[PDB]
Protein backbone atom coordinates (compact mmCIF):
# COMPACT_ATOMS: atom_id res chain seq x y z
CA UNK A 1 0.00 0.00 0.00
CA UNK A 2 3.01 2.14 0.98
CA UNK A 3 1.84 4.88 3.16
CA UNK A 4 0.55 7.61 0.76
CA UNK A 5 -0.09 10.90 1.90
CA UNK A 6 -3.59 9.96 1.87
CA UNK A 7 -3.06 6.77 4.04
CA UNK A 8 -1.09 8.63 6.86
CA UNK A 9 -3.67 11.16 6.99
CA UNK A 10 -6.02 8.31 7.74
CA UNK A 11 -3.97 6.86 10.85
CA UNK A 12 -3.50 10.28 12.38
CA UNK A 13 -6.94 11.04 12.14
CA UNK A 14 -8.01 7.60 13.74
CA UNK A 15 -5.43 7.96 16.69
CA UNK A 16 -6.63 11.27 17.64
CA UNK A 17 -9.95 9.61 17.88
CA UNK A 18 -8.51 6.85 20.35
CA UNK A 19 -6.77 9.24 22.81
CA UNK A 20 -9.80 11.05 23.01
CA UNK A 21 -10.91 8.37 25.65
CA UNK A 22 -8.20 6.59 27.45
CA UNK A 23 -9.98 4.88 30.48
CA UNK A 24 -12.51 3.34 27.99
CA UNK A 25 -10.40 2.38 25.07
CA UNK A 26 -7.66 1.03 27.53
CA UNK A 27 -9.84 -1.17 29.74
CA UNK A 28 -11.42 -2.43 26.28
CA UNK A 29 -8.15 -3.08 24.93
CA UNK A 30 -7.42 -5.45 28.20
CA UNK A 31 -10.70 -7.27 27.97
CA UNK A 32 -10.06 -8.00 24.07
CA UNK A 33 -6.71 -9.14 25.23
CA UNK A 34 -8.12 -11.67 27.92
CA UNK A 35 -10.80 -12.80 25.35
CA UNK A 36 -8.27 -13.71 22.78
CA UNK A 37 -6.03 -15.31 25.63
CA UNK A 38 -7.15 -15.63 29.38
CA UNK A 39 -3.95 -16.95 30.83
CA UNK A 40 -2.40 -13.56 29.98
CA UNK A 41 -3.81 -12.28 33.16
CA UNK A 42 -1.11 -13.58 35.63
CA UNK A 43 1.39 -11.34 33.77
CA UNK A 44 0.14 -8.06 34.85
CA UNK A 45 0.94 -6.92 38.70
CA UNK A 46 -2.01 -4.96 38.56
CA UNK A 47 -4.22 -7.83 37.27
CA UNK A 48 -2.66 -10.64 39.60
CA UNK A 49 -4.79 -11.43 42.65
CA UNK A 50 -7.61 -9.63 41.07
CA UNK A 51 -10.53 -11.57 39.62
CA UNK A 52 -11.78 -8.92 37.03
CA UNK A 53 -9.87 -6.24 34.97
CA UNK A 54 -9.85 -3.18 37.19
CA UNK A 55 -11.44 -0.20 35.35
CA UNK A 56 -9.78 2.74 37.20
CA UNK A 57 -6.45 1.63 38.00
CA UNK A 58 -3.87 4.29 36.97
CA UNK A 59 -1.35 1.79 36.60
CA UNK A 60 -3.40 0.05 33.88
CA UNK A 61 -4.34 3.35 32.03
CA UNK A 62 -0.95 4.69 31.86
CA UNK A 63 0.25 1.41 30.69
CA UNK A 64 -2.29 0.94 27.62
CA UNK A 65 -2.00 4.64 26.44
CA UNK A 66 1.62 4.37 25.99
CA UNK A 67 1.01 1.26 23.80
CA UNK A 68 -1.25 3.04 21.10
CA UNK A 69 0.90 6.12 21.04
CA UNK A 70 3.77 4.33 20.06
CA UNK A 71 1.84 2.64 17.02
CA UNK A 72 0.63 5.98 15.60
CA UNK A 73 3.93 7.60 15.81
CA UNK A 74 5.16 4.73 13.87
CA UNK A 75 2.73 5.39 10.84
CA UNK A 76 3.79 9.00 10.45
CA UNK A 77 7.27 8.29 10.57
CA UNK A 78 6.59 5.68 7.74
CA UNK A 79 4.84 8.19 5.32
CA UNK A 80 7.37 11.04 5.85
CA UNK A 81 10.39 9.14 5.99
CA UNK A 82 9.46 5.73 4.59
CA UNK A 83 10.70 3.80 7.96
CA UNK A 84 10.19 3.13 11.91
CA UNK A 85 13.22 4.45 13.92
CA UNK A 86 14.54 2.20 16.99
CA UNK A 87 15.51 4.37 20.02
CA UNK A 88 16.41 4.06 24.02
CA UNK A 89 12.92 3.65 24.94
CA UNK A 90 12.14 0.82 22.53
CA UNK A 91 15.28 -0.80 23.83
CA UNK A 92 14.16 -0.67 27.49
CA UNK A 93 10.80 -1.89 26.37
CA UNK A 94 12.23 -4.95 25.12
CA UNK A 95 13.86 -5.55 28.81
CA UNK A 96 10.92 -5.11 30.84
CA UNK A 97 8.98 -7.53 28.53
CA UNK A 98 11.31 -10.24 29.12
CA UNK A 99 11.34 -9.75 33.14
CA UNK A 100 7.78 -10.15 33.13
CA UNK A 101 7.50 -13.41 31.28
CA UNK A 102 6.18 -12.00 27.62
CA UNK A 103 6.89 -14.00 24.45
CA UNK A 104 6.50 -13.20 20.46
CA UNK A 105 3.36 -15.34 20.26
CA UNK A 106 1.83 -12.95 22.55
CA UNK A 107 2.03 -10.06 19.74
CA UNK A 108 -0.78 -11.16 17.25
CA UNK A 109 -2.78 -11.14 20.58
CA UNK A 110 -2.19 -7.52 21.24
CA UNK A 111 -2.49 -6.65 17.15
CA UNK A 112 -5.88 -8.10 16.77
CA UNK A 113 -6.74 -6.48 20.03
CA UNK A 114 -5.55 -2.96 18.63
CA UNK A 115 -7.28 -3.49 14.96
CA UNK A 116 -10.38 -4.54 16.56
CA UNK A 117 -10.07 -1.70 19.09
CA UNK A 118 -9.46 1.00 16.11
CA UNK A 119 -12.31 -0.55 14.08
CA UNK A 120 -14.29 -0.01 17.13
CA UNK A 121 -12.95 3.50 17.66
CA UNK A 122 -13.53 4.94 13.77
CA UNK A 123 -16.64 3.09 13.08
CA UNK A 124 -18.29 3.85 9.41
CA UNK A 125 -15.27 5.70 8.25
CA UNK A 126 -13.61 2.41 8.36
CA UNK A 127 -12.13 1.67 4.84
CA UNK A 128 -9.97 -0.82 3.49
CA UNK A 129 -7.48 1.93 2.88
CA UNK A 130 -7.43 2.57 6.81
CA UNK A 131 -7.21 -1.09 8.00
CA UNK A 132 -4.47 -1.36 5.56
CA UNK A 133 -2.73 1.71 7.05
CA UNK A 134 -2.86 0.48 10.97
CA UNK A 135 -1.89 -2.97 10.00
CA UNK A 136 1.11 -1.71 8.17
CA UNK A 137 2.09 0.60 11.13
CA UNK A 138 1.69 -2.17 14.02
CA UNK A 139 3.39 -4.73 11.98
CA UNK A 140 6.22 -2.33 11.29
CA UNK A 141 6.45 -1.31 15.11
CA UNK A 142 6.29 -4.94 16.47
CA UNK A 143 8.93 -5.93 14.19
CA UNK A 144 11.12 -3.35 16.06
CA UNK A 145 10.23 -4.41 19.81
CA UNK A 146 10.39 -8.11 19.28
CA UNK A 147 13.67 -7.28 17.94
CA UNK A 148 14.70 -5.63 21.29
CA UNK A 149 13.32 -8.48 23.61
CA UNK A 150 15.17 -11.06 21.88
CA UNK A 151 18.07 -8.89 22.57
CA UNK A 152 17.19 -8.50 26.38
CA UNK A 153 16.84 -12.31 26.85
C1 LIG B 1 3.85 -2.94 19.43
C2 LIG B 1 3.27 -3.62 20.51
C3 LIG B 1 3.59 -3.29 22.09
C4 LIG B 1 3.85 -2.07 22.62
C5 LIG B 1 3.95 -0.70 21.82
C6 LIG B 1 4.04 -2.24 24.15
C7 LIG B 1 4.38 -1.24 25.10
C8 LIG B 1 4.66 -1.45 26.59
C9 LIG B 1 5.16 -0.42 27.53
C10 LIG B 1 5.40 1.04 27.01
C11 LIG B 1 5.40 -1.02 28.85
C12 LIG B 1 5.88 -0.32 30.20
C13 LIG B 1 4.69 0.33 30.69
C14 LIG B 1 5.06 1.11 32.02
O15 LIG B 1 6.21 1.35 32.37
O16 LIG B 1 4.23 1.72 32.60
C17 LIG B 1 4.99 -2.41 28.79
C18 LIG B 1 4.95 -3.34 29.96
C19 LIG B 1 4.44 -4.63 29.93
N20 LIG B 1 3.96 -5.26 28.69
FE21 LIG B 1 3.91 -4.51 26.68
N22 LIG B 1 3.82 -3.54 24.55
C23 LIG B 1 3.55 -4.22 23.35
C24 LIG B 1 3.21 -5.58 23.33
C25 LIG B 1 3.02 -6.50 24.45
C26 LIG B 1 2.56 -7.89 24.39
C27 LIG B 1 2.23 -8.66 23.03
C28 LIG B 1 2.45 -8.38 25.77
C29 LIG B 1 1.97 -9.79 26.28
C30 LIG B 1 0.77 -10.00 26.54
C31 LIG B 1 2.88 -7.33 26.71
C32 LIG B 1 2.97 -7.43 28.21
C33 LIG B 1 3.48 -6.51 29.14
C34 LIG B 1 3.70 -6.69 30.72
C35 LIG B 1 3.39 -7.97 31.65
C36 LIG B 1 4.26 -5.54 31.18
C37 LIG B 1 4.69 -5.22 32.72
C38 LIG B 1 3.63 -4.49 33.35
C39 LIG B 1 3.72 -4.65 35.00
O40 LIG B 1 3.55 -5.79 35.59
O41 LIG B 1 3.36 -3.69 35.62
N42 LIG B 1 3.18 -6.22 25.88
N43 LIG B 1 4.56 -2.64 27.41
How remote is the CA of residue 105 from the centroid of ligand 1, in Å? 14
Is 18 exposed, middle or buried, given 0-12, 13-18 or 19+ CB atoms closer than 10 A? buried
The approach used to solve this structure was: X-ray
Distance CA 36, CA 42 (A): 15
Q: What is the 3-state secondary structure (H, E, C) of the chain?
A: CCCCHHHHHHHHHHHHHHHCCHHHHHHHHHHHHHHHCHHHHHHCCCCECECCCCCCCHHHHHHHHHHHHHHHHHHHHHHHCCCCCCCHHHHHHHHHHHHCCCCHHHHHHHHHHHHHHHHHHHHHHCCHHHHHHHHHHHHHHHHHHHHHHHHHC
Which mutation among 96, 98, 115 tests ligand 1's pocket best, with the greatest number of atoms within 8 A of CB? 96
How remote is the CA of residue 102 from the centroid of ligand 1, in Å? 8
Resolution attained, angstroms: 2.0
CATH number of the domain enclosing 74: 1.10.490.10
Domains of the chain: total: 1
The packing angle between helices 58-80 and 128-152, to 10°, is: 110
Residue 37: domain span: 1-153
Protein residue closest via CA to atom 41 of ligand 1? 45
> Please, what's the largest Cα pairwise distance for the chain?
47
Amino acid sequence: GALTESQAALVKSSWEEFNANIPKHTHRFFILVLEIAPAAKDLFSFLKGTSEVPQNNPELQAHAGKVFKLVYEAAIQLEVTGVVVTDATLKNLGSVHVSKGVADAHFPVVKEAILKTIKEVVGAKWSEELNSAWTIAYDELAIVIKKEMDDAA
